[PDB]
Design an enzyme around this catalytic site. Sequence first.
Site, mmCIF file in Angstrom:
data_model
loop_
_atom_site.group_PDB
_atom_site.id
_atom_site.type_symbol
_atom_site.label_atom_id
_atom_site.label_comp_id
_atom_site.label_asym_id
_atom_site.label_seq_id
_atom_site.Cartn_x
_atom_site.Cartn_y
_atom_site.Cartn_z
ATOM 1 N N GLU A 54 0.892 -1.190 -0.008
ATOM 2 C CA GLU A 54 -0.081 -0.194 0.024
ATOM 3 C C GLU A 54 0.800 1.371 0.021
ATOM 4 O OE1 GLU A 54 -1.913 0.869 3.828
ATOM 5 O OE2 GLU A 54 -3.579 2.217 2.868
ATOM 6 N N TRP A 88 -8.490 -2.150 0.388
ATOM 7 C CA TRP A 88 -9.353 -1.127 -0.158
ATOM 8 C C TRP A 88 -10.597 -1.822 -1.437
ATOM 9 C CZ3 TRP A 88 -9.189 4.017 0.588
ATOM 10 C CH2 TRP A 88 -8.199 4.403 1.519
ATOM 11 N N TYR A 129 -4.642 9.541 -1.466
ATOM 12 C CA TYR A 129 -3.306 9.224 -1.169
ATOM 13 C C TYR A 129 -2.260 8.886 -2.443
ATOM 14 C CZ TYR A 129 -5.903 8.192 3.112
ATOM 15 O OH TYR A 129 -6.697 8.060 4.298
ATOM 16 N N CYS A 143 -7.167 10.135 6.083
ATOM 17 C CA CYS A 143 -7.230 9.972 7.392
ATOM 18 C C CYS A 143 -5.722 10.393 7.958
ATOM 19 C CB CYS A 143 -7.491 8.455 7.763
ATOM 20 S SG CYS A 143 -9.122 7.771 7.287
ATOM 21 N N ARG A 166 -6.639 12.432 11.375
ATOM 22 C CA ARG A 166 -8.054 13.025 11.452
ATOM 23 C C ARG A 166 -8.992 11.964 12.318
ATOM 24 N NH1 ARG A 166 -11.821 11.147 8.575
ATOM 25 N NH2 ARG A 166 -11.584 10.684 6.433
ATOM 26 N N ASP A 175 -9.032 4.488 13.236
ATOM 27 C CA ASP A 175 -9.340 3.097 13.526
ATOM 28 C C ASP A 175 -8.401 2.386 14.345
ATOM 29 O OD1 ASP A 175 -10.825 0.781 13.949
ATOM 30 O OD2 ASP A 175 -10.828 0.359 11.792
HETATM 31 N N1 LIG Z 1 -13.289 2.086 8.617
HETATM 32 C C1 LIG Z 1 -11.926 1.935 7.940
HETATM 33 N N2 LIG Z 1 -11.854 2.237 6.692
HETATM 34 C C2 LIG Z 1 -10.809 2.027 6.071
HETATM 35 N N3 LIG Z 1 -10.427 2.325 4.863
HETATM 36 C C3 LIG Z 1 -9.108 2.165 4.294
HETATM 37 C C4 LIG Z 1 -8.710 1.617 5.522
HETATM 38 C C5 LIG Z 1 -7.050 1.156 5.674
HETATM 39 C C6 LIG Z 1 -7.231 -0.427 6.076
HETATM 40 C C7 LIG Z 1 -8.329 -1.157 5.421
HETATM 41 C C8 LIG Z 1 -8.279 -2.455 6.047
HETATM 42 C C9 LIG Z 1 -7.281 -2.919 6.858
HETATM 43 C C10 LIG Z 1 -7.273 -4.446 7.098
HETATM 44 O O1 LIG Z 1 -8.330 -5.405 6.829
HETATM 45 N N4 LIG Z 1 -6.387 -4.817 7.848
HETATM 46 C C11 LIG Z 1 -5.877 -5.910 8.399
HETATM 47 C C12 LIG Z 1 -5.748 -6.140 9.946
HETATM 48 C C13 LIG Z 1 -5.323 -7.072 10.568
HETATM 49 C C14 LIG Z 1 -5.300 -7.069 12.128
HETATM 50 O O2 LIG Z 1 -4.358 -6.117 12.149
HETATM 51 O O3 LIG Z 1 -5.848 -7.516 13.057
HETATM 52 C C15 LIG Z 1 -5.220 -8.314 9.967
HETATM 53 C C16 LIG Z 1 -5.540 -8.456 8.722
HETATM 54 C C17 LIG Z 1 -5.940 -7.192 8.067
HETATM 55 C C18 LIG Z 1 -5.967 -7.457 6.514
HETATM 56 C C19 LIG Z 1 -4.982 -8.204 5.734
HETATM 57 O O4 LIG Z 1 -5.040 -9.473 5.836
HETATM 58 O O5 LIG Z 1 -3.975 -7.576 5.066
HETATM 59 C C20 LIG Z 1 -6.258 -2.298 7.091
HETATM 60 C C21 LIG Z 1 -6.313 -0.731 7.007
HETATM 61 C C22 LIG Z 1 -9.594 1.660 6.697
HETATM 62 C C23 LIG Z 1 -9.594 1.243 7.920
HETATM 63 O O6 LIG Z 1 -8.805 0.488 8.707
HETATM 64 N N5 LIG Z 1 -10.936 1.327 8.538
HETATM 65 O O1 LIG Z 2 -5.213 4.890 7.147
HETATM 66 C C1 LIG Z 2 -6.450 4.838 7.631
HETATM 67 N N1 LIG Z 2 -6.561 4.592 8.937
HETATM 68 C C2 LIG Z 2 -7.713 4.744 9.761
HETATM 69 O O2 LIG Z 2 -7.727 4.845 10.809
HETATM 70 N N2 LIG Z 2 -8.843 4.629 8.805
HETATM 71 C C3 LIG Z 2 -10.181 4.443 9.208
HETATM 72 C C4 LIG Z 2 -10.589 5.997 10.368
HETATM 73 C C5 LIG Z 2 -12.153 5.485 10.154
HETATM 74 O O3 LIG Z 2 -12.567 4.414 10.998
HETATM 75 C C6 LIG Z 2 -12.363 5.367 8.889
HETATM 76 C C7 LIG Z 2 -12.648 6.699 8.012
HETATM 77 O O4 LIG Z 2 -14.232 6.861 8.371
HETATM 78 P P1 LIG Z 2 -14.324 8.561 8.506
HETATM 79 O O5 LIG Z 2 -13.871 9.339 7.089
HETATM 80 O O6 LIG Z 2 -15.642 8.764 9.010
HETATM 81 O O7 LIG Z 2 -13.269 9.027 9.644
HETATM 82 O O8 LIG Z 2 -11.056 4.760 8.165
HETATM 83 C C8 LIG Z 2 -8.849 4.611 7.482
HETATM 84 C C9 LIG Z 2 -7.424 4.586 6.765
HETATM 85 F F1 LIG Z 2 -7.488 4.496 5.788
#
Ligand SMILES: Nc1nc2[nH]cc(Cc3ccc(C(=O)Nc4cc(C(=O)O)ccc4CC(=O)O)cc3)c2c(=O)[nH]1
Ligand SMILES: O=c1[nH]c(=O)n([C@H]2C[C@H](O)[C@@H](COP(=O)(O)O)O2)cc1F
Lengths: 507, 506
Positions: free
Chosen positions: B279, B301, B327, B387, B408, B411
């Site tokens: 990424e 994504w 990004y 974010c 900002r 998660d």
């Molecule tokens: N709400 C919200 N929206 C977002 N949009 C974009 C993002 C970025 C993002 C989106 C998804 C992931 C994700 O699935 N990660 C992950 C975490 C663990 C673990 O750490 O236990 C284990 C496996 C994986 C997947 C893998 O197997 O590679 C991480 C980051 C984002 C977000 O995090 N939250």
């Molecule tokens: O790099 C990242 N870090 C992160 O914390 N989020 C999470 C924050 C939140 O849970 C969500 C965005 O929702 P919102 O636009 O309401 O903040 O994505 C997403 C990413 F891509």
Amino acid sequence: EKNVSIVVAASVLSSGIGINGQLPWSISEDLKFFSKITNNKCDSNKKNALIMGRKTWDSIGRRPLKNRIIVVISSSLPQDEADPNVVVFRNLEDSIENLMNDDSIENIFVCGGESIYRDALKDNFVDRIYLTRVALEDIEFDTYFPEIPETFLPVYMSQTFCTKNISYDFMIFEKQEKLKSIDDTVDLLGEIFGIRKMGNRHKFPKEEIYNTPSIRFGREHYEFQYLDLLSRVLENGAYRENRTGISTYSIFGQMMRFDMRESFPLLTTKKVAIRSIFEELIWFIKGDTNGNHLIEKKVYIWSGNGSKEYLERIGLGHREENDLGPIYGFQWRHYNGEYKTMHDDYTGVGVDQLAKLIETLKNNPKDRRHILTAWNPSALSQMALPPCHVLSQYYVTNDNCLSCNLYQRSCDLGLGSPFNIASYAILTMMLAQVCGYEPGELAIFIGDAHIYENHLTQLKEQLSRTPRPFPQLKFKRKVENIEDFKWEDIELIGYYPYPTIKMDMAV
Amino acid sequence: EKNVSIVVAASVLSSGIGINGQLPWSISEDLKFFSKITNNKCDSNKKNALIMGRKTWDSIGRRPLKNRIIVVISSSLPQDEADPNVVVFRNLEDSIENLMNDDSIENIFVCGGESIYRDALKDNFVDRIYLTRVALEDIEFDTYFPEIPETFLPVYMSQTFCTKNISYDFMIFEKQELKSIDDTVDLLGEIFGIRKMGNRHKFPKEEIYNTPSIRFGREHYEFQYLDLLSRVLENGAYRENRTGISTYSIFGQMMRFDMRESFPLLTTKKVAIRSIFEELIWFIKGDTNGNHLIEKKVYIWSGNGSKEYLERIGLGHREENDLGPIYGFQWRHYNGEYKTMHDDYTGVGVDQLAKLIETLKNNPKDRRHILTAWNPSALSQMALPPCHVLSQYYVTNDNCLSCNLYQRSCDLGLGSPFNIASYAILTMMLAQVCGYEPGELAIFIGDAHIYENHLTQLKEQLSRTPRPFPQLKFKRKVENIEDFKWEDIELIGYYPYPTIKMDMAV
Ligand SMILES: Nc1nc2[nH]cc(Cc3ccc(C(=O)Nc4cc(C(=O)O)ccc4CC(=O)O)cc3)c2c(=O)[nH]1
Ligand SMILES: O=c1[nH]c(=O)n([C@H]2C[C@H](O)[C@@H](COP(=O)(O)O)O2)cc1F
Ligand SMILES: NC(=O)C1=CN([C@@H]2O[C@H](COP(=O)(O)OP(=O)(O)OC[C@H]3O[C@@H](n4cnc5c(N)ncnc54)[C@H](OP(=O)(O)O)[C@@H]3O)[C@@H](O)[C@H]2O)C=CC1
Ligand SMILES: NC(=O)C1=CN([C@@H]2O[C@H](COP(=O)(O)OP(=O)(O)OC[C@H]3O[C@@H](n4cnc5c(N)ncnc54)[C@H](OP(=O)(O)O)[C@@H]3O)[C@@H](O)[C@H]2O)C=CC1
Ligand SMILES: Nc1nc2[nH]cc(Cc3ccc(C(=O)Nc4cc(C(=O)O)ccc4CC(=O)O)cc3)c2c(=O)[nH]1
Ligand SMILES: CN(Cc1cnc2nc(N)nc(N)c2n1)c1ccc(C(=O)N[C@@H](CCC(=O)O)C(=O)O)cc1
Ligand SMILES: CN(Cc1cnc2nc(N)nc(N)c2n1)c1ccc(C(=O)N[C@@H](CCC(=O)O)C(=O)O)cc1
Ligand SMILES: O=c1[nH]c(=O)n([C@H]2C[C@H](O)[C@@H](COP(=O)(O)O)O2)cc1F
């Protein structure tokens, strides 16, 4: 042997405690503090003794206090044994018969006006002082609290609270008389790894540069969030050059929080020009980049970065004298707008970020995108100075309070920082009133936190001043649009700072 | 009565301390720690006693240690009285003649291999344990350090140090058996409820505090993340958001990480480091095509780039995974007229990353090394606003590159562990191309929140005592920052806890 403490509420400067046989104010939360601090005990079969003078005994209606034994010092009151909750002694020395005798009394409290306070300190009977500093000084007093002797050192200073627009804090003074193995292991690791151990890059400030160093575990007053940042820079700041001829001592990655619910974060260790802070903030909101509009209102903070000599140096000799270019308030109201000069009409051009911020704050408060930016890399070269306070985010709590987070890339701790603390506090309060919320918290995240080397003797002077409770900032009227605020609409209540400190700006 | 402590260096998982009569490693800083911890005393007319077994006494060459008296436990060695710095006892019990008698000895240290370690703990002689956890586990051991009994609790865990690409930390274990300021603060907390800011930032309860026995020695910078989880669980307000999954949120938080001696990759959970890198290099290359990540088996994504999700936020005219100018499009083509993910944007917009790299080496002490992603003119075209919004970089006097990031919305279950590693790698990439070394990483957070479907998962993660951070090293030097590949990355000494499955809120 047992403890003997003083409980008192005195004014912040002259230490006044009474007038015409009564208090100079009416603060209900302070009385509750008196209640809980004098009822605090361990043995359920013991009670606390409250020593007071006769005139003070008259001021509380000559009625006992629940669960406590009142001791009255008088030369005329009859030693009536009918009431067991009220006993009379002829002098303060004899009244302290509770140390070597009367095991039913656990703790002793002194709170009986100037006569008892002064005699309890002169005869060296007091071990601890609970002080409630009240920010009221242009009123009449007739009884004062004696000056705290040098044998006492402050060990706690609470945050600033508010009651009827009156600022007050709570302090504890202790009388000086003369984990274990974890600190040793950390010191040894610091000898092995020099700058490899991150702790050695963030050394705790030495006592000689620590503001009121006796307050070690009770640095609750949020002005310490700024005073301790100065100390950390003086301790770990690296001597570095910059675009100006004046070098700084710089560290990277610092923050400081401030409360805005019960007080206003305007520094008390130095008289801050609050009017110039506001006139600059309203200058941003109105979308204005004309530097003459601040000089016309006798605000000269943007004169250095807007002179013919400075503009020609950075390659902007084609602009007028004070044409600062698209800066704060042009990225707020006209983001990505094609800037020409300071005289053109930009109404409608660019992205009105502040308007979209205000509309989003009331239509969708729990949104996580209330962001006001000023970093436009397409317009940095046209700016007389790139933005220092770069990005700010806003947050509505569940109890309808508006908090603010600011990222500052470069922070002049001598001049810009006290301005940035108050400026974004006022801006949040303005946004809170227009949106119908209350002020919350203020967090400032800093990149290059530095001290200019010509500010060293000044900032060391400021660190020698024990802080005072923050003032209060209230708005006199409710405005319909945020651009309508005026300096007359602002009331600064209870600001008793130390004398101003002159410091030159590095152009 | 005096103190009796154990000094030992064991591996992180199996607790191995030796092989073939010698150490399984060669860490000079660890020996200096043994030197300084056994020489530390108060009385100049007293010495410290180092108890060891015979096989350990042979491994150090049978030569004394300066300023210290060595006590050897052996059943065969002659009790020679010629050397006063070396004395021999027949058993460990009789050897403890220094406590109630012999006032010339101040402190006692046990350090004599598995045989002496196990008997010193079995017979309950040890008051404190100085443990040096070494991140080496796929080698051969023949003597191990016994499992620390339940009567010991950790009270200190240092940061992770590095020596020859070997991660190691320092811990202290203790055996369990002001004054008026805390009362006055509590009383003020009863008078003013939520009016006192302290009550809005309550210290986390013991039930949600990771390894709560370590109270004054939380030096390991993974606590900067684990304690943020604890603060959210204690003060987080239940709030709704754009997704169907509510969160517990607080506002205004930070956490620092060291990058000089370690890499901030969480050990309390196996983090998918490969997906983080792919990424990050996807951002640097300026790419917004979401298929290029799925083609490399990276599905992070996919949720924010589906036909159903894009039509909901009003971007139904885009392709399946056309995430829009996000990004890496504000990094390389800021203010550029975005069309689709297939168009050629070479030369359009402001290349911030290029100008950042050139400024970092041509003017390092400049206070303007800023890479932004918040472009209010293009927010409506984005599949998801940034974010990690703004980042600033700083060149120290000793040629180290630090990084500050403002986020900002964070998660803490999924995005936060990714953002910690992502901006750590990016700083290292910027450090190599500019000729500097990695420095520090500070992340400033706005809306730090936990999604309610992550509660049982994150509470499980808080039950795991952290392990030393791994090491991240690059195998080759690149000419341009876009040339990094996954094969060029070597992750050394990463021994995490099992992975924890958590669902993303779309
Ligand atoms: N709400 C919200 N929206 C977002 N949009 C974009 C993002 C970025 C993002 C989106 C998804 C992931 C994700 O699935 N990660 C992950 C975490 C663990 C673990 O750490 O236990 C284990 C496996 C994986 C997947 C893998 O197997 O590679 C991480 C980051 C984002 C977000 O995090 N939250
Ligand atoms: O790099 C990242 N870090 C992160 O914390 N989020 C999470 C924050 C939140 O849970 C969500 C965005 O929702 P919102 O636009 O309401 O903040 O994505 C997403 C990413 F891509
Ligand atoms: N802000 C605060 O925390 C407090 C404020 N106050 C204020 O202070 C004012 C009252 O205090 P103040 O005017 O100083 O009067 P005092 O409360 O100190 O009482 C004085 C009286 O106590 C007796 N007394 C004092 N000293 C001696 C002595 N050495 N030997 C024998 N008897 C002694 C005398 O009574 P007698 O006439 O019988 O001889 C004397 O008149 C009020 O306005 C009150 O509201 C009071 C307490 C706390
Ligand atoms: N990583 C670390 O911190 C350390 C690692 N090590 C490693 O561990 C290995 C050595 O440890 P290990 O193999 O267990 O041997 P030991 O160091 O524990 O020494 C054992 C010997 O001590 C004597 N001894 C032990 N117990 C008793 C007893 N109850 N009564 C009488 N005599 C006793 C015996 O010698 P005898 O034959 O004379 O009776 C025994 O053979 C080495 O590889 C060394 O490098 C060692 C120290 C520290
Ligand atoms: N290097 C550098 N360049 C910058 N360009 C623009 C700024 C903003 C700014 C420029 C000037 C000032 C300034 O003079 N303030 C001030 C401070 C104190 C005090 O707090 O002791 C007391 C009085 C005053 C003046 C008054 O009397 O009103 C403050 C802020 C800026 C900067 O701060 N530093
Ligand atoms: C002697 N005195 C004057 C007075 C007023 N304000 C003070 N404030 C402080 N911080 N310290 C003092 N010694 C003090 N003294 C007193 C003492 C008690 C009460 C009083 O009414 N106490 C009730 C308070 C009831 C309450 O509101 O909860 C109690 O329960 O003790 C008022 C004035
Ligand atoms: C018993 N033993 C094996 C050994 C090796 N590493 C360890 N590491 C730890 N953390 N703890 C131990 N007990 C330990 N023991 C030892 C003891 C001393 C020296 C030694 O050379 N000490 C010198 C070290 C010189 C130095 O490099 O400064 C000293 O001054 O104490 C080596 C191995
Ligand atoms: O609001 C401000 N805050 C601030 O701290 N400065 C100081 C920081 C630094 O001393 C200088 C910015 O110059 P540079 O861009 O080189 O960091 O102005 C200026 C402001 F306008």
